[PDB]
Ligand binder design. Structure first.
Ligand SMILES: NC(=O)c1ccc[n+]([C@@H]2O[C@H](COP(=O)([O-])OP(=O)(O)OC[C@H]3O[C@@H](n4cnc5c(N)ncnc54)[C@H](O)[C@@H]3O)[C@@H](O)[C@H]2O)c1
Length: 393
């Protein structure tokens, strides 16, 4: 038996629970701490089976029916004996799930952020304390699927599934179930998973600057006058924004290189240029992507047209659970990242938050971020190993 705990109750959690419980030999427990969402899920499901509708790209559709063993808000029930603990929620919820699982997580547990995405390991090391060096930590670059719930607790739709997907790993002292293949088995044939060389590679390759950069490209020195309708998102970028993305991507390499120079045995060679990343030139590569057709900026109705809607996950997530975390790493490496910095400073004010001030992580809301320094990881080796330096005597 491969005992799996799925944390969350959103789109991904529905899909994962559905796809995972359908696998032979797997026991799925759903943990959700958001009020009484578990109780709402159970009551909604009843005695029926959970349904996942997959568009095969292209083989029409597929009916996947399965039932988890239990759906609970009690971490004791969901986490005890769990071989794999997978977090599929927006990163702001991650704190609570680590806190709830901590007294119950077994040494051989594989802890997976699906996503994830930045500072996930630092947060895990902090909350789980001494047990963090025992468990394994796995960080996936994004969600496996474009998916949405069609009916709460009962029905979820997969619009499309990724071809390839990468995940990083920090091995603990405990032997877990095999990370890559177990996660593959749970997901079926697609997406085909690959193991990234290093967790910092994954963290930097998340390209946290992208959405803040695109928003800065379209609304940088925005006069405060409306536009006829919602302008194109990715396909609506200018040349200067394509340069801006290149600048920030080079800074990513700079931090990677400096980590590799200062710390041998840590392979960060798969940290890439954003143009070189895919899976003519950068500008045209973004604009002529049929995966970006008809995707528009977040807009709200105002006087004489529509204004940008800055209250969105492009900044509320991607800054504190992305750019700040990369800035925290940059500081420790001794690499100024001016282009990244300028984006942080701008996106900061737009959401009414403050993390970075004069190139230093002293902002009012820096505590709600996952930058290593927030948790006390102030050196590169403390970032890499999770061990804080203690001198005597
Ligand atoms: N769903 C997609 O098609 C899509 C595609 C690619 C990437 N992603 C990424 O995957 C991640 C997860 O996606 P999702 O669609 O499952 O997210 P979601 O928005 O659907 O998940 C919402 C869930 O978060 C939890 N939650 C919300 N508010 C909370 C709070 N107040 N306190 C405690 N818990 C709370 C609840 O369990 C809720 O069910 C996101 O970061 C997103 O950027 C999503």
């Amino acid at each position: 038996t491969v005992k799996v705990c799925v944390c969350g109750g959103g789109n991904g959690a529905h899909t994962l629970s559905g796809l995972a419980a359908s696998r032979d030999g797997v026991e799925v427990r759903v943990l959700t701490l958001f009020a009484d969402e578990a109780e709402r899920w159970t009551k909604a499901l009843g005695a029926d089976e959970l349904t996942v509708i997959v568009n095969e790209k292209d083989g029409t559709q597929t009916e996947v029916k399965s039932r988890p063993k239990v759906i609970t808000k009690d971490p004791e029930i969901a986490i005890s004996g769990a071989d794999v603990v997978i977090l599929t929620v927006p990163a702001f919820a991650h704190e609570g799930y680590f806190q709830a699982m901590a007294p119950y997580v077994q040494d051989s547990a594989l802890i997976v952020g699906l996503p994830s995405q930045a500072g996930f390991e630092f947060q895990c090391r902090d909350i789980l304390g001494d047990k963090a060096a025992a468990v394994s930590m796995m960080s996936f670059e994004t969600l496996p699927w474009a998916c949405r719930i069609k009916e709460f607790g009962r029905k979820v739709e997969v619009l499309g599934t990724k071809s390839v997907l990468a995940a990083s790993l920090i091995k603990g002292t405990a032997k877990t179930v095999d990370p890559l293949s177990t996660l593959q088995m749970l997901h079926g044939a697609e997406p085909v998973f690959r193991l990234a060389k290093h967790f910092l590679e994954m963290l930097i390759m998340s390209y946290s600057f992208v959405h803040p950069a695109i928003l800065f490209g379209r609304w940088g020195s925005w006069d405060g006058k409306p536009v006829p309708e919602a302008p194109l998102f990715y396909q609506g970028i200018d040349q200067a924004t394509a340069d801006m993305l290149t600048a920030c991507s080079n800074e990513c390499k700079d931090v990677a290189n400096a980590i590799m120079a200062a710390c041998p045995g840590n392979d960060l060679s798969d940290v890439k240029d954003i143009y070189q990343w895919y899976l003519h030139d950068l500008y045209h590569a973004i604009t002529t992507n049929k995966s970006y057709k008809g995707l528009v900026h977040p807009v709200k109705a105002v006087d004489g047209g529509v204004a940008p809607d800055f209250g969105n996950r492009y900044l509320t997530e991607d800054i504190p659970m992305g750019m700040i975390v990369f800035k925290g790493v940059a500081i420790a490496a001794g690499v100024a990242i001016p282009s990244n910095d300028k984006l942080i400073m701008w996106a900061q004010e737009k959401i009414g938050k403050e993390y970075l001030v004069d190139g230093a992580l002293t902002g009012k809301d820096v505590a709600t971020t996952r930058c290593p320094q927030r948790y006390g990881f102030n050196t590169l080796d403390a970032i890499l190993t999770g061990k804080k330096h203690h001198h005597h005597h």
